[PDB]
Design a protein around this ligand. Structure first.
Ligand SMILES: [Mg+2]
Ligand SMILES: [Mg+2]
Ligand SMILES: [Mg+2]
Ligand SMILES: [Mg+2]
Ligand SMILES: [Mg+2]
Ligand SMILES: [Mg+2]
Ligand SMILES: [Mg+2]
Ligand SMILES: [Mg+2]
Ligand SMILES: [Mg+2]
Ligand SMILES: [Mg+2]
Ligand SMILES: [Mg+2]
Ligand SMILES: [Mg+2]
Ligand SMILES: [Mg+2]
Ligand SMILES: [Mg+2]
Ligand SMILES: [Mg+2]
Ligand SMILES: [Mg+2]
Ligand SMILES: [Mg+2]
Ligand SMILES: [Mg+2]
Ligand SMILES: [Mg+2]
Ligand SMILES: [Mg+2]
Lengths: 262, 153, 206
RNA sequence: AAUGUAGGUAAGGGAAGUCGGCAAGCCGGAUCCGUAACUUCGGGAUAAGGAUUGGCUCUAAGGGCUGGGUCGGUCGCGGCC
RNA sequence: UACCUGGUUGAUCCUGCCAGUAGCAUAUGCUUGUCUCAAAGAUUAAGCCAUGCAUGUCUAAGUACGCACGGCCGGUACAGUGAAACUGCGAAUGGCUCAUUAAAUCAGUUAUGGUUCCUUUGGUCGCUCGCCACUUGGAUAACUGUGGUAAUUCUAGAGCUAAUACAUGCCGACGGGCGCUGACCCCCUUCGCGGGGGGGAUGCGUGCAUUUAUCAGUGGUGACUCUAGAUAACCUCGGGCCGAUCGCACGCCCCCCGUGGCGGCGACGACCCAUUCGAACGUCUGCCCUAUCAACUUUCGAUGGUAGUCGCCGUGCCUACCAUGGUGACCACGGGUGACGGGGAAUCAGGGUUCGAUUCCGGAGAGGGAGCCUGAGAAACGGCUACCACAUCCAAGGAAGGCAGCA
RNA sequence: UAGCGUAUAUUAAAGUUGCUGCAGUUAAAAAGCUCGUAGUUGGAUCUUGGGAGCGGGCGUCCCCGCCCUCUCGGCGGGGCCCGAAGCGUUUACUUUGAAAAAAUUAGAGUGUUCAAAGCAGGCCCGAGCCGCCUGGAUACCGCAGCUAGGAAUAAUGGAAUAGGA
RNA sequence: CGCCGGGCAGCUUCCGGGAAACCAAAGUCUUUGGGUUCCGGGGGGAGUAUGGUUGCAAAGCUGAAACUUAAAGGAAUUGACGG
RNA sequence: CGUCGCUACUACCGAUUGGAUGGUUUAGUGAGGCCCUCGGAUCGGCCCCGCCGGGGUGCCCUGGCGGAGCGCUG
């Protein structure tokens, strides 16, 4: 190509978007933003396929342009704005708030939250550097950068960013024994406790995490988001508590649900 | 040999040589300080690189190169080029149809710092990937081990 | 045009490579700046990303730093005396990144008397009386004299730099890249580097 | 003056002249490339074919002779250990 | 479903091929009532193309004195709807085809501590001491009028008129601080000298970005010649930033008074940093047939060294000076391919054998080459320039082309 | 059987390309003979059995416990413990984990009226349900690269002028 | 008269193999894997053409295709025939 | 079984310094673009200043013709 691409084929779209095949040839193609397009949920499919508030891209465009969609405390009129991980979606006209969190199957779930919980938001710091006049800076997992953080905050820690101010209220150090969530790879969406961290210089650090039920897995360091102090989460966990259960104990859960409902 | 064998003045860019020779500096004799660094990954910088006098802008320890990427190894084949050698890596390629392997090899031209003085053909050199140093050179010798030697008859 | 591709070269084995595409723009080259000495002339070229590059076609001044004395002044370049790459660059007086040139030592001398109050470059004195007579005495007080006489002791200049100051021209090595930044900054040669380049020049001629 | 003998030049064509390219003409030195069939493997071969060549101002490279003392511990401004 | 059958003999056991047998994938012949999906000028010609379409775009929020309409509410800069035009953005995506291409493309892996990056998002935008600022200058569109040519999305002359176009350029913060220079003065061991400090008048530079040189060692990597500090200076007239911009409701202070000063929400904009989309060259391993291709590369870069040039950057990318290297029976090099690579497809005991022009990813190309302008991004072709080959119009002076886009 | 024939490429049949897995006296076939470098392949040998309780039931089955060192043990000076450093070779091998686009393949669910498909759908509605419950799994993905266990097999080394620990 | 080792062989054997003739190797092969080299793929065209290379020459080594063909062959049995 | 004779078909050798069509290149000529050094058809500013003018009072605040300063300049 002679320049950047601005189309996204329907079948080449990310799997977790859960887009079918027969509805179209193209995919939303999210605009550039705080999150990469591989792990973002554009508002068009969030409001058309996850909530069914809209039947068409035109209807979700009307909803967006009427300025009801507030993301992270700011109104976004972009139809294809990349929402991403744990950005608070706020609709004040219908009076509910959403937190965008992966489920046990590594897909963004429709997670409803109270306004007082929605007022804050967790972020994973991605780099800490000192800039001119000796001013410390902090770049989170979003594109959000802030000045003058707590000097105790190190790389790949978690910070509590209260909305409408953007400042830090609290933070969780990346330490052994802290509740985390996997934000990439096969274990995407699994909640557990940091148990071990082996570090390979010149390469990727591998962290071993054990969940509540005792199923211990591992993942790369860059795919980890600390979400709680020790074991109590600082956010509202979705249904299933991020406990991935295999198909063997999923099928009988389905059968028990059918028996109870029938 | 003296290190000034080139048309230009060979020197380490980081070190400043003309540090104001004055009365408090007892001249002579003041030894010129040497710039060196540890290259990480557990490799220890050799004493010859610590306290030699050679100038090599491509030396992993006293030059402007950073070691990152792949760390691999080979066997010294020829030492005929200036400051660089060629090594042979021997590997087995798997052919599925016959369930058997195939003896293959590749030659790699790697840069050899002068801090490694007793390097002979047949020795095992651990090399690390760096930025392209020449058209065919992308690796630096980080460690040298003898091949059943450590003695002469 | 002029291309900086790697695919037009032979393979390491010596085999001839065939191109799988025509020339692309991002692998382009541009004609050399070939910076001369004269009245200032700087052209501007647009480069990749919309950024700016300065082709210094002619330069006559440059910012050169002493280093040992930490005095950095904007002086005048007289001519090129040696070049490690090509002798033709010396002959055509082409200013490149590592060629050594002759620069005016007037600002360095001015700083030397204004800082140490010693005759540098003078032969017999009494030749600039409305200024040198002031800058030698200044009729200054006890504390200022205590500063100056303390600074006297380490006011030693190497005999090579002293000879150059007597001649009025220092020889200094460029450090910037004219034709990329459009300026000819550099540093004054001194010490073993100075002796090396002096011997190179003397072996070249004489 | 003719005609000769010896020497030149000639537009356009280029052996149509003539028994016959006879005669004349072309080529030509040196440097750098590059050279076929065939062959008794030595040759063919300066094959064939192509490029360069002035003046002036420079820049490199290719050598030969001498001498390298740490010194009054001294007197044959100089000589032995 | 891990399968066989006929044919050499007068007859028999074999070897062995021929033929049968089943599938899919192209064509074709005959036939064809319903219905659901659905390939479809790849194979030969990446051959040639008439005609038509395929890329344009406006919000309250850049510029409306078009009468082209229209509220005027009537003494008013501009109500409003708005053609055209300037400006900005896009046209570098998409679509098509598979000719070239055999460590090349491409696949997995890994790096950019060796680079650039429109837009989005987030930082940063009184950090600089330095007779218009209650707002500076000129031009040009659109528009009127005069034309030329046979022709074109060709344009000339003349006369107006705007800016978030193009330039120019302050105030404010601003009180000072800091670092050098330091007139002199004061307190001082006082003592006949030296004194150890305090002030300081006058001068010169101060911020971010750039380009050098030097010093020291707030945060970070496995590892910086990292980041952040301090010093000396630079800072390119085709020359960095340090807002002369546009809408929406409209309110507060009035001592000084009485016309001034304050205000909220936006939009646009920016030098720089981060992020996102990427891109580019790199690392490791992997490709079909061929020896009736065994030695290649190296003057004219082949392998490496030193210093540069150029490039967005690392690198023989190129140049100069050196070294004589580099690759090969573990198949180099050369040649062929009816070769774009891969995900995949057919067949199906297991192992394999063939096929992948073809909707997804990556690459290449736009009749063949080549060279460029603009722009963040193109060596662009529904952009330009030139040559070659085809080819349109012509009043023979010229002018205009590119369906491997959809038909 | 609304399909069937023919031509052609290719697959199976073909154990008539044979790695699995063919042959070579006479059917086609082992060089006239020997040496010989690449290539390929290479003899044997270094830890075995004794232990206690959970134990494929000491139930003389045995899930199984096994009867490396040194550094601040983060619960300049405590036994209330587990973290900073190295591996008394280097590998191949095997197992695990990570990271490996989707579609296609296998395969879970789902009466598309059945199916090829698709990724949907289902529960009540007594009419007020001013709405409830779900799914959009999982597997494979060679080779090369990364990580952690095992140490049989295979290669490779350590002390012989001791230049050894 | 015996024993052992290495040979050239012979007789015999339902070891076993083989299409059989036969073979103690031509056995230890669908119960298929000790290491390794060369080499065959129906019969002809053809060991021909061409290229290369060796040779004084004769020739040696390497070595196709077009085309043609349904058999050509091996071992045994019965018969017919045999100067 | 082979020569010879006839008829077909397929290849081979072969004078013809054969012929045709591709591809890759030496050399010569060489469009066009880009860069550099010049170039300066034109278009502007200041010095305007032959002058009427002139106001803080011949000493211009400049409101226009005008020569042209026949220079400095973009
Ligand atoms: Mg003539
Ligand atoms: Mg003539
Ligand atoms: Mg004749
Ligand atoms: Mg005649
Ligand atoms: Mg003659
Ligand atoms: Mg001849
Ligand atoms: Mg000449
Ligand atoms: Mg092709
Ligand atoms: Mg393909
Ligand atoms: Mg494609
Ligand atoms: Mg292209
Ligand atoms: Mg742009
Ligand atoms: Mg083009
Ligand atoms: Mg088959
Ligand atoms: Mg067979
Ligand atoms: Mg035979
Ligand atoms: Mg051998
Ligand atoms: Mg063994
Ligand atoms: Mg063998
Ligand atoms: Mg045969």
């Amino acid at each position: 190509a002679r320049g950047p691409k601005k189309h996204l084929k329907r079948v080449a779209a990310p799997k977790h978007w859960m887009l079918d095949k027969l509805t179209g040839v193209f995919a939303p193609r999210p605009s550039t933003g705080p999150h990469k397009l591989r792990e973002c949920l554009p508002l068009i499919i969030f409001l058309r396929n996850r909530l069914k508030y809209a039947l068409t891209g035109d209807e979700v465009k009307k909803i967006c342009m009427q300025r009801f969609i507030k993301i992270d405390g700011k109104v976004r009129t972009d139809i294809t704005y990349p929402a991403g991980f744990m950005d608070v979606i706020s609709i004040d006209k219908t009076g509910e708030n959403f937190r965008l969190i992966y489920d046990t199957k590594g897909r963004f779930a429709v997670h409803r939250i109270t306004p007082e919980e929605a007022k804050y938001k967790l972020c994973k710091v991605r780099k800490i550097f000192v800039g001119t006049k000796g001013i410390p800076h902090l770049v989170t997992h979003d594109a959000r950068t802030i000045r003058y953080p707590d000097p105790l905050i190190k790389v790949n820690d978690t910070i509590q960013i209260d909305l409408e101010t953007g400042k830090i209220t609290d933070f969780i150090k990346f330490d052994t024994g802290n509740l985390c969530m996997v934000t990439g790879g096969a274990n995407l969406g699994r909640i557990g406790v940091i148990t071990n961290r082996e570090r390979h210089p010149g390469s990727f650090d591998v962290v071993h995490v054990k969940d509540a039920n005792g199923n211990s897995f591992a993942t790369r360091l860059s795919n980890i988001f600390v979400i709680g102090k020790g074991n109590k989460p600082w956010i509202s966990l979705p249904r299933g508590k991020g406990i991935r259960l295999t198909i063997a104990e999923e099928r009988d859960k389905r059968l028990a649900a059918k028996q109870s409902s029938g | 040999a003296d290190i000034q064998t080139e048309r230009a003045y060979q020197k380490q860019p980081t070190i400043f040589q003309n540090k104001k020779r004055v009365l408090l500096g007892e001249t002579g004799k003041e030894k010129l300080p040497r710039y060196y660094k540890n290259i990480g990954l557990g490799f220890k910088t050799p004493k010859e690189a610590i306290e030699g006098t050679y100038i090599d802008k491509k030396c992993p320890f006293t030059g402007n190169v950073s070691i990152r990427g792949r760390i691999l190894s080979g066997v010294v084949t020829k030492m005929k080029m200036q400051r660089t050698i060629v090594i042979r890596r021997d590997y087995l390629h798997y052919i599925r149809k016959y369930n058997r392997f195939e003896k293959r090899h590749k030659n790699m031209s790697v840069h050899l710092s002068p801090c490694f003085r007793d390097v002979q053909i047949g020795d095992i050199v651990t090399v690390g990937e760096c930025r392209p140093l020449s058209k065919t050179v992308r690796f630096n010798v980080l460690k040298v081990t003898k091949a059943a030697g450590t003695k002469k008859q | 045009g002029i291309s900086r591709d790697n695919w037009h070269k032979r393979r390491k084995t010596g085999g001839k490579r065939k191109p799988y595409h025509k020339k692309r723009k991002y692998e382009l080259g541009r004609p050399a700046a070939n910076t001369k000495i004269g009245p200032r002339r700087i052209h501007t070229v647009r480069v990749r990303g919309g950024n700016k590059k300065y082709r210094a076609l002619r330069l006559d001044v440059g910012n050169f730093s002493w280093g040992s004395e930490c005095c950095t002044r904007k002086t005048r370049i007289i001519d090129v005396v040696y070049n490690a790459s090509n002798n033709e660059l010396v002959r055509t007086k082409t200013l490149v990144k590592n060629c050594i040139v002759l620069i005016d030592s007037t600002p360095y001398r001015q700083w030397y008397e204004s800082h140490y109050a010693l005759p540098l470059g003078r032969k017999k004195g009494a030749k600039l009386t409305p200024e040198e007579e002031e800058i030698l005495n200044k009729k200054r007080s006890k504390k200022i004299q205590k500063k100056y006489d303390e600074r006297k002791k380490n006011a030693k200049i190497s005999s090579l730099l002293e000879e150059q100051f007597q001649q009025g021209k220092l020889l200094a090595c460029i450090a910037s890249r004219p034709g990329q930044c459009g300026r000819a900054d550099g540093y004054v040669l001194e010490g073993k580097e100075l002796e090396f380049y002096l011997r190179k020049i003397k072996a070249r001629k004489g």
